[model samples]
Target: MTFAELGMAFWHDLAAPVIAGILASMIVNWLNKRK
Candidate 1:
């Protein structure tokens, strides 16, 4: 793959777990508050 494509994929993979964790925390907080 090209450098640009590889770099994009690199950041995308790097950020996915961080973003997903934040998103899951937000959802869990919302659910707990709704109880």
Candidate 2:
């Protein structure tokens, strides 16, 4: 892939896990509080 495409893919791959983790933590916290 081109440099730009590679960079974009790398950034997205890096960001997705962080975003997912944040959302997962929020959900878990909410569930624990609910219970």
Candidate 3:
């Protein structure tokens, strides 16, 4: 694949889940701290 296509595919495949994981982790930590 070309560089542009490869970057897009990588973002779609890995970036999303990584962002979600970080957000979820932050939320969980915030909830715990609120108690």
Candidate 4:
């Protein structure tokens, strides 16, 4: 892949984990509150 494509892919990959972590944390917090 080209440099620009590689850079975009890298950023997208990095963001996926961060977004998932935020969503996971919110779900866990909500479940904890329900208990």
Top TM-score prediction, candidate number? 1
Task: Encode model 4's per-residue lDDT on 6-30: one tens digit a residue.
Answer: 9989989999999999999999999
What C-alpha lDDT does candidate 3 achieve relative to the native structure? 0.93
lDDT of 2 by residue, 1-35 (tens): 59998998999999999999999999999999988
lDDT of the candidates, in the order given: 0.94, 0.95, 0.93, 0.95
How well is each residue in 1-35 modelled by candidate 1, as lDDT tens digits?
59998998999998999899899999999999999
Looking at model 2, the pairs that clash are none
The C-alpha stretches of model 2 lying farther than 4 A from their native spots are none
lDDT of 3 at 25: 93
Query: How many clashes in each structure?
Result: 0, 0, 0, 0
Q: How does model 4 fare in lDDT?
A: 0.95
What is the Cα-based lDDT of residue 24 in candidate 3? 100
Worst 10 residues of 2 by lDDT: 1-10
For candidate 3, what is the total of clashing residue pairs? 0
**Local lDDT at 7 for model 4:** 92
